[PDB]
Amino acid sequence: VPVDYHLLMMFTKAEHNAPLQAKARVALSSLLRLAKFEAHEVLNLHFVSEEASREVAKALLRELLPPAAGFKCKVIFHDVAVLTDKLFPVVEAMQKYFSAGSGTYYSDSIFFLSVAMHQIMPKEIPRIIQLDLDLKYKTNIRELFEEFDNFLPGAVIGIAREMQPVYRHTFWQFRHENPKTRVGDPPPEGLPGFNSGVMLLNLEAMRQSPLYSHLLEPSWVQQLADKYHFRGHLGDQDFFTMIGMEHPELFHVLDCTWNRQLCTWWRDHGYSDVFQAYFRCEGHVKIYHGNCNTPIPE
């Protein structure tokens, strides 16, 4: 009885963008080199792309497939334009809070895809892992799927913490008005917010959660953004971070080794002292994330 595994990656504006293509190459080669799946299993690779990037991705993929490990792999493309239009009704009201900069543009809607993925993917897909393309996999991606099993009651999404003090900065006013808050503080005891590079989207649990459905409503988005005095430009990452402050029950926090972020931009922009408490990650690394164009070591 065939068992499907689903990954989704954004791959847009990739034509004449050599840096993006090279990242995609590093991510997809390491992914496929180290992947291992049983005989009846199939790895479905979903790409969100406009037509030029679909062609770029196809040329890259033919070079990498079939995988050395010989397992079944299926490639699927989703039109960024089609998805944008399906997303917009759900996602419109949050855009003004979490998009560069204001107000509400179609071009920003796709950065909220994860938040409404359960309404975009067919109901036959119960779970999907959304992954950035500036990653490098140091293990078998099949192992990430067992983290779905660790979701507690009410949890809908698996996500790793943000490893820079960006949300310490973003939540300044709320932190100012609430000296004792954990919002924006480093781990192990603070809520530093989330990074969107690796996300376990339990589409069934998202669909089936009354709480999660309410938070998507325009008035709830507005109430919380006002409560937290919150403004961002990182899209889905900012929305999850915010509702994560109100309702941490919704999120299964992945260990930092599943999304080891390398970006240090915030260290050199006012946070030298505290930076280390946010950025510390130890253990055997599973995925490196070369965010803010940070070279990944080897």
């Binding site: 300044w172 430009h233 922009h269 006012g270």
Partner: protein, 35 residues
Amino acid sequence: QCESNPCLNGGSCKDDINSYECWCPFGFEGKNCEL
């Protein structure tokens, strides 16, 4: 995308059109908290 606003107030992008003041994180000065 946009460059993060180094200022503590105003929008999330630097040179937020609706912002005039720039309150810099401790130890930094200037219109872009440069020095």
